[PDB]
Amino acid sequence: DWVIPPISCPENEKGEFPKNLVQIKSNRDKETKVFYSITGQGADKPPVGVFIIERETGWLKVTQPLDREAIAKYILYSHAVSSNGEAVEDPMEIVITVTDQNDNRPEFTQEVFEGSVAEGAVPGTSVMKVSATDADDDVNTYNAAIAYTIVSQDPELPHKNMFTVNRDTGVISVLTSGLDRESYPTYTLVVQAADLQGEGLSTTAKAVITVKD
Amino acid sequence: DWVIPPISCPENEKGEFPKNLVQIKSNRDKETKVFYSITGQGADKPPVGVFIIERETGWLKVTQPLDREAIAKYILYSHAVSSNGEAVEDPMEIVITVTDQNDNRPEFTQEVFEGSVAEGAVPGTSVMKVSATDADDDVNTYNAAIAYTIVSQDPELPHKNMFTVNRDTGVISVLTSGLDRESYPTYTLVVQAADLQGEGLSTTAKAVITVKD
Ligand SMILES: [Ca+2]
Ligand SMILES: [Ca+2]
Ligand SMILES: [Ca+2]
Ligand SMILES: [Ca+2]
Ligand SMILES: [Ca+2]
Ligand SMILES: [Ca+2]
Ligand SMILES: [Ca+2]
Ligand SMILES: [Ca+2]
């Protein structure tokens, strides 16, 4: 059977609703007056009424802004019924794909990460790892591509850049020498996670490093 | 059978070619690898290659700017063939409607219209009729809605507005009194026909009026 390929519809649509997606048609339009309807999740099943269809023209419409992180794909079924009340077609499967917008900030797995390092650890020694997730599309876009940075260091002694972070993995390492437990035993690093490879939306968390003997 | 409704494509398309129109699909995509093709006038028959289809994806494309005044409607047929060489679908009728642009100037049926009027004819007396046609869409648009005007009068005596024209019908009538055969026996009127109810493209012709006894 001839069918419509999956329809792509962007999430967070702005403006006037409803918006047209595609028009369906039964070739038995000539034989009899045909009326169109839709069933399935997104139509008559939860969430109800997100998609509607014009009964006479066959225009499939969307009634509200979509959220890809709530529902990313819809499977509907179109129906064709004559004025006499007989179904003139077998129900057609209609797929609606929701396409991504960068509307989710990266989120750290927890607010405070804790770590420790030996005082005499050589520069380049891995200490700890911070991690973040992103709810956006990590398959099609860079909307979930997280880059890690260090925003600030407290205290800024003996130098303000005692540690560094790997922007891909989130691993925090000793950058320079001069760590000293009996001078400055604790460091609070404010770490940032930004999507779009570092260019987009961002969030911050804390990395608390304790200096050991 | 489920079919695509007539596709509308504007004439005189500008930019990069080919341009996508619609995507077709056979549901037997899961069973076997399917290859798509198109037949009919506009595809493999004259005019050949105006519309093409991508064999694997099923994207119907247009390769060149259309001319509605040459061809206003195309009827194509889509085919679905498996990698094994069997037709997996009955050919589907695809209709392509060409939508109008205002790219045809109104054209008078002839260059010079001739007419005559009795000297003592009362103001308001019909003398002659000028007529024009327009190649554009007179059903859907105002692109063929012609309004008639008089541009100039030669000579401009005894007054410069001896005659007037009906902007709808093109009928030229005596506007004012003072026509005189033995003073000015001949008048050349330059008449204009403009589409968009008088606002669009225009052309001129001549109306030669001879004054009788
Ligand atoms: Ca969202
Ligand atoms: Ca998103
Ligand atoms: Ca994001
Ligand atoms: Ca020490
Ligand atoms: Ca044209
Ligand atoms: Ca035209
Ligand atoms: Ca015109
Ligand atoms: Ca006289």
Structure commentary:
- It is classed as cell adhesion.
- The entry lists the keywords Cadherin, Ecad, E-cadherin, strand swap, Calcium, Cell adhesion, Cell junction, Cleavage on pair of basic residues, Glycoprotein, Membrane, Phosphorylation, Transmembrane.
- It forms a dimeric assembly.
- The entry is titled "mouse E-cadherin domains 1,2".
- Chains A, B: Epithelial-cadherin (E-cadherin) (Uvomorulin) (Cadherin-1) (ARC-1) (CD324 antigen).
- With 213 residues, chain A is mainly β.
- The first copy, chain A, has 2 domains: 3-101, Cadherins (Immunoglobulin-like), CATH 2.60.40; 102-213, Immunoglobulin-like (Sandwich), CATH 2.60.40.
- Helices cover 0% and strands 44% of the residues of chain A.
- The first copy, chain A, contains no helices and 18 strands.
- Chain A has strands spanning 2-3, 7-10, 19-23, 25-26, 34-39, 51-53, 59-62, 73-82, 92-99, 107-108, 112-118, 126-129, 132-133, 147-154, 163-165, 171-174, 186-194, 202-212.
- Chain A has a 4-stranded mixed sheet, with no helix packed on it. Chain A has a 4-stranded mixed sheet with strand order 11-18-17-14, with no helix packed on it.
- In chain A, strand 6 and strand 7 (59-62) form a beta hairpin.
- Chain A is rod-shaped and about 90 Å long.
- The N and C termini of chain A lie far apart (74 Å).
- The A-B interface holds A 1-5, 23-28, 58, 78, 80, 89, 92-93 and B 1-5, 23-28, 58, 78, 80, 89, 92-93.
- One calcium ion (CA) binds at residues 11, 68-69, 100-101, 103-104, 136 of chain B.
